[PDB]
Design a binder for this molecule. Structure first.
Ligand SMILES: [Mg+2]
Ligand SMILES: [Mg+2]
Ligand SMILES: [Mg+2]
Ligand SMILES: [Mg+2]
Ligand SMILES: [Mg+2]
Ligand SMILES: [Mg+2]
Ligand SMILES: [Mg+2]
Ligand SMILES: [Mg+2]
Ligand SMILES: [Mg+2]
Ligand SMILES: [Mg+2]
Ligand SMILES: [Mg+2]
Ligand SMILES: [Mg+2]
Ligand SMILES: [Mg+2]
Ligand SMILES: [Mg+2]
Ligand SMILES: [Mg+2]
Length: 70
RNA sequence: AGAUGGUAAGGGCCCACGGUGGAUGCCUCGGCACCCGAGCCGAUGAAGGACGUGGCUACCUGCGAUAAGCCAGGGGG
């Protein structure tokens, strides 16, 4: 992902509630599966998207853990 | 009547050139010694492991379902 898009992702994430972060992670893990399915049938030439979503999910869960940690 | 040479199936010695083999010399990522520095880790689960982890990934390295990585500060360019 572009550095600017990563910065923005964290800014918006840090404004979300724990509940919204959970819902969002759930949806991104759903999209990851969809990406897996495509990569499995050789229909995902943009394979960089898989790593990207995975790190997004990690960033999201990192912030979720941030919110809950205090 | 007599006398003495050319035979090389193959062999021997020498010479040339190869093959095999990996000595020798050069080399060094590694090692050895001494000296100095530094010196504990663990139930907040250690030491050490198993299994995982990559779009394609056998192994090694890293990492742990957030899985060759997540956040932030510092360095750097
Ligand atoms: Mg990043
Ligand atoms: Mg004769
Ligand atoms: Mg002869
Ligand atoms: Mg002959
Ligand atoms: Mg002889
Ligand atoms: Mg020879
Ligand atoms: Mg020889
Ligand atoms: Mg050789
Ligand atoms: Mg020498
Ligand atoms: Mg020590
Ligand atoms: Mg261990
Ligand atoms: Mg491994
Ligand atoms: Mg960082
Ligand atoms: Mg940094
Ligand atoms: Mg920096």
């Amino acid at each position: 992902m572009k550095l600017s898009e990563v910065r923005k992702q964290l800014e918006e994430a840090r404004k979300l509630s724990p509940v919204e972060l959970e819902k969002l992670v759930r949806e991104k893990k759903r999209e990851l599966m969809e990406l897996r399915f495509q990569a499995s049938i050789g229909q995902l030439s943009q394979n960089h998207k898989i790593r990207d979503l995975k790190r997004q999910i990690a960033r999201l869960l990192t912030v979720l853990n941030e919110k809950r940690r205090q």
